[PDB]
Swiss-Prot record:
Compartments where located: Vacuole
UniProt GO cellular component terms: plant-type vacuole
Gene Ontology biological process terms, A to Z: regulation of monoatomic ion transport
Subunit structure: Calcium and pH-dependent interaction with NHX1 (increases when pH decreases, better at pH 5.5 than at pH 7.5). Also interacts with the CPB protein At2g18750.
Primary localization: other
Protein species of origin: Arabidopsis thaliana
Listed SUPFAM superfamilies: EF-hand
Task performed by this protein: Potential calcium sensor that modulates ion selectivity of NHX1.
Record's keyword terms, sorted: Calcium, Metal-binding, Repeat, Vacuole
Record GO terms (molecular function): calcium ion binding
Family annotation (InterPro entries): Ca-binding_regulatory (IPR051111), EF-hand-dom_pair (IPR011992), EF_Hand_1_Ca_BS (IPR018247), EF_hand_dom (IPR002048)
Name of the protein: Probable calcium-binding protein CML18
Domain of life, per lineage: Eukaryota
């Protein structure tokens, strides 16, 4: 049921004093205390480490629902469509999106990124740490971000 999703995002925005869309250490601990859970800085942190998939440092609604109900955060597209888009991005078609390909693509997209913005897009979407982005990390990234724009 998506009404469950709705109530969860409402609780989120309530405990998100900053309304930036991401929960911090203090807000996560305060929510968990609101539900009557004594969180140790250790628990609070292990939790953050279990959810922060983009390594941002803050827990976003997608990460929250991913720690809680893994398959509730569901992809809005299909693997064939996302494969077409990943082909659009990986121009050399080697199966990996380099920072060069990502920058050239975002340039075609009129998004004049900076070295720091591209580093963040890689540091956020790259999981296996090779510096590029394969199709699995690509789908992870777009599904985590699409789910955020749907419920934020
Ligand atoms: Ca926050
Ligand atoms: Ca995060
Ligand atoms: Ca490439
Ligand atoms: Ca990678």
């Amino acid at each position: 049921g998506d009404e469950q999703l709705a109530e969860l995002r409402e609780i989120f925005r309530s405990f998100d004093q900053n309304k930036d869309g991401s929960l911090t250490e203090l807000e996560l601990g305060s929510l968990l205390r609101s539900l009557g859970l004594k969180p140790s800085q250790d628990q609070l942190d292990t939790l953050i480490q279990k959810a922060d998939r983009n390594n941002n440092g803050l827990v976003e609604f997608s990460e929250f629902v991913a720690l809680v109900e893994p398959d509730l955060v569901k992809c809005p597209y299909t693997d064939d469509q996302l494969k077409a888009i990943f082909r659009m991005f990986d121009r050399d078609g080697n199966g990996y999106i380099t920072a060069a390909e990502l920058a050239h693509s975002m340039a075609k997209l009129g998004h004049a990124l900076t070295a720091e913005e591209l580093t963040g897009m890689i540091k956020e979407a790259d999981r296996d740490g090779d510096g590029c982005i394969d199709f699995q990390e690509f789908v992870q990234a777009i599904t985590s971000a699409a789910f955020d724009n749907a419920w934020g």
